[PDB]
Amino acid sequence: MPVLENRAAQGDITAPGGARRLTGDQTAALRDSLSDKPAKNIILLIGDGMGDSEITAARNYAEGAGGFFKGIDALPLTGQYTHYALNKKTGKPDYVTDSAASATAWSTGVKTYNGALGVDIHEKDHPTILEMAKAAGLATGNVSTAELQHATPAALVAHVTSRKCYGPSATSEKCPGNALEKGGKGSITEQLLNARADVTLGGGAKTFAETATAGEWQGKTLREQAQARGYQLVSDAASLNSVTEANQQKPLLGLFADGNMPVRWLGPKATYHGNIDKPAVTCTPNPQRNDSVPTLAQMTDKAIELLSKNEKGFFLQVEGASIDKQDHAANPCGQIGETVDLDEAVQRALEFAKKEGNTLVIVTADHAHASQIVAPDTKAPGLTQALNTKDGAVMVMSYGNSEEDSQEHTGSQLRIAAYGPHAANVVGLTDQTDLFYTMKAALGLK
């Protein structure tokens, strides 16, 4: 099964046939990309808020219009899926989903309300693909650049009525029924500790400072609890690289930031008439991204190394989280940089999957977002910014769906791409919940 080695404009884009990305007929190559054999492993890569518009803007800037993302664009089977949520009261669709309801959909196969994690509209728990993978004996990983309490990575290991129930104090207030001191399963962080995935890496060390209100580890901080239960904690790239093994006996918990991990690039926020009233922007690397802080690709690689030792196979979910967050912030450079960062992670995953031969790689997003690529002379009501692209030309990006401080998610269907056994199941129009069933089946989970 071939990965698309190169789909950049083949020549002079101003010349006939120069902007072509194909060099011949793809039928044969697609035929070689189809296989219903079982997938031994599955690597799911989620770009939070990475809709088609976000992929296009990143490519344009970092690779040029005629460019090609070696990871993101390289997957041969592509499709488009829907991700609407449900109204808790009515059960009717809620066209624009949040990060929690969408992550729950692919992780449990059941639609739910905005803000819910691992539960349906009746607030019933439903086992997640990770819990199922672990029950079957497969190794499991959960990697993200956001706090581990954030919706995307949490959905795989927690079941709470509100995504805000990060740790003990919020759970007591927001999720009383989940509150440990009230007989519930616990907060997102407490449930994460219980889920015991083999590899968990991300930020959110802050919440791990809270102390349990009840149970066996009452009075100890969640950090202390983690150590007491046998988790090997690492807090930087050096210690992370030191790790030789990770399993149920000695599970890995990497906390690389108090909150979300640092963004790769820096740039100013989009402003009103910014493309007109101000000069073009050129993003700059964040001096604080650090040599001690592992990158998403580094984390993905270590995770694969450690999880691949499990002979039964593994399930790994990787999240490029700040794409969505910078999109909310109307910061083109942060958004694009996190897209570039995710591409590197996808590349590592594809390299392994290509050698290994029984791995299903899927790259998609939870929901669409605000950013739109518009004409340079656009006079828009929202925030816009002009950027100097690799092409040596200006690209103007617009954020116009909100007068508040955060730009809103949008409900357009978006790209889902895959490579490996069962990749055929992402082609055409599918639903986010279909992704749960595709993975369960590809993995032979029962």
Contact flag: residue 258 with its own copies (CB under 8 A): no
Residue of the chain from 1, 110, 266, 445 that contacts its own copies (CB under 8 A): 110
Binding to Zn ion in span 120-159, by CB under 5 A:
152
The CA distance from 327 to 323, in Å, is 6
* Cβ proximity to its own copies, 52 vs 351, nearer residue: 52
Contact flag: residue 280 with its own copies (CB under 8 A): no
Contact flag: residue 48 with Zn ion (CB under 5 A): yes
Is there a catalytic annotation at residue 99? yes
Contact flag: residue 39 with its own copies (CB under 8 A): no
How far is the CA of 346 from the CAs of 45, 69, 82, 362, 418, in angstroms? Answer: 7, 10, 22, 9, 11
The CA distance from 329 to 391, in Å, is 25
- Let me know: does 216 contact 276? Beta carbons within 8 Å: no
Binding residues for Zn ion, rule CB under 5 A, total 6
Query: Hey, what are 32's tokens?
Result: 């070689």
Contact flag: residue 378 with its own copies (CB under 8 A): yes
Contact flag: residue 76 with its own copies (CB under 8 A): yes
Contact flag: residue 322 with its own copies (CB under 8 A): no
Contact flag: residue 100 with its own copies (CB under 8 A): no
* Cβ proximity to Zn ion, 142 vs 310, nearer residue: 142
Stretch that binds its own copies, among 245-253, 316-324, 338-346, 372-380 (CB under 8 A): 372-380
How far is the CA of 330 from the CAs of 169, 219, 291, 322, 380, in angstroms? Answer: 31, 41, 27, 12, 14
- Let me know: does 17 contact 23? Beta carbons within 8 Å: no
Pure H helices in 85-174? 99-108, 129-135, 151-154, 168-174
> Which residue reads 């919020």 in tokens?
170
**Residue count (the chain):** 446
Contact flag: residue 49 with its own copies (CB under 8 A): no
* Cβ proximity to its own copies, 280 vs 374, nearer residue: 374
Contact flag: residue 329 with its own copies (CB under 8 A): no
Contact flag: residue 424 with its own copies (CB under 8 A): yes
The CA distance from 323 to 338, in Å, is 5
Q: Which does 190 bind (CB under 5 to 8 A by kind): Zn ion, its own copies, none?
A: none
Query: What count of other Cβ atoms lies within 10 Å of the Cβ of residue 176?
Result: 14
Stretch that binds its own copies, among 107-115, 134-142, 169-177, 258-266 (CB under 8 A): 107-115
Binding to Zn ion in span 365-384, by CB under 5 A:
366
Give the containing element (helix H, strand E) for 142: strand 139-147
Binding to its own copies in span 123-152, by CB under 8 A:
126
Query: Hey, what are 88's tokens?
Result: 């808790």
The CA distance from 261 to 286, in Å, is 12
Contact flag: residue 161 with its own copies (CB under 8 A): no
Side-chain half-sphere CA neighbours of 408 within 13 A: 12
Residue by residue, DSSP assigns 228-274 as HTT-EEE-SHHHHHH----SSSS-EEEE--SSSPPPSEE-PPPEETH
Contact flag: residue 372 with its own copies (CB under 8 A): yes
**Minimal distance in Å, beta carbon 143 to Zn ion?**
12
Residue of the chain from 209, 228, 238, 375 that contacts its own copies (CB under 8 A): 375
Binding residues for its own copies, rule CB under 8 A, total 105
Contact flag: residue 106 with its own copies (CB under 8 A): no
- Let me know: does 340 contact 285? Beta carbons within 8 Å: no
Side-chain half-sphere CA neighbours of 394 within 13 A: 16
Per-position b or e across 372-405, b if 16+ CB within 10 A of its CB: beeeeebebebbbbbbebeeeeebbbbbbbeeee
The CA distance from 291 to 287, in Å, is 10
* Cβ proximity to its own copies, 295 vs 402, nearer residue: 402
Contact flag: residue 338 with Zn ion (CB under 5 A): no
Catalytic residue among 33, 99, 162, 187: 99
Backbone angles phi, psi at 350, to 5 degrees: -75, -35
* Cβ proximity to its own copies, 93 vs 259, nearer residue: 93
Residue of the chain from 420, 430, 439, 443 that contacts its own copies (CB under 8 A): 430
Contact flag: residue 21 with its own copies (CB under 8 A): yes
* Cβ proximity to Zn ion, 3 vs 160, nearer residue: 160
Binding-residue pattern over the window 304 to 333 for Zn ion, x denoting contact by CB under 5 A: -----------------x--x---------
Stretch that binds its own copies, among 166-174, 283-291, 302-310, 391-399 (CB under 8 A): 391-399
**Minimal distance in Å, beta carbon 415 to Zn ion?**
15
Catalytic residues, which ones? 99
- Per CB under 5 A, residues contacting Zn ion are 48, 99, 152, 321, 324, 366
